Amino acid sequence: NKLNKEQQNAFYEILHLPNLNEEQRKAFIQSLIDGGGDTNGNGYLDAEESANLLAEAKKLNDAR
C-alpha cells in the first residue's frame, strides 16, 4: 500500500545490528517515529532522513 518502505527497512536493519546495546537500539528506532529523524521537521520521515539515520546506526555499530 502506501507503506514507507525506507522507514520500515531502516527499522528492520537497526533491529538486527548485532553490536548495538539496548539503549542505542532504542534511541535509533525511536527517532524513526517521534520526529527526531525528521530533520526538516515537515511531519514525514523522508527517504533522505531514513537513509541518514540508518547510516548513523551502522556507523555506531561498526565502531563497536
Partner 1 sequence: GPSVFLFPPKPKDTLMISRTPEVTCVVVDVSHEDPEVKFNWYVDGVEVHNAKTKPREEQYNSTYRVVSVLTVLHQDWLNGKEYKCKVSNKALPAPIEKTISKAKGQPREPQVYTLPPSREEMTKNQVSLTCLVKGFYPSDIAVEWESNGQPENNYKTTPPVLDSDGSFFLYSKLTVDKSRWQQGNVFSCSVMHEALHNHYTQKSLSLSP
**Binding footprint of partner 1 on the chain (CB under 8 A):** 1-5, 7-9, 11-12, 15, 22, 25-26, 29, 32-33
Footprint of Ca ion on this chain (CB under 5 A)? Answer: 38, 40, 42, 46
The least CB distance from residue 20 to partner 1, in Å, is 10
- Alpha helices, DSSP H, located in the chain: 5-16, 22-30, 47-63
Residue type (1 letter), 58: K
Task: Find which of Ca ion, partner 1, none residue 46 binds, CB within 5 to 8 Å per kind.
Answer: Ca ion
Distance of CA 13 to the CA centre of its chain: 8
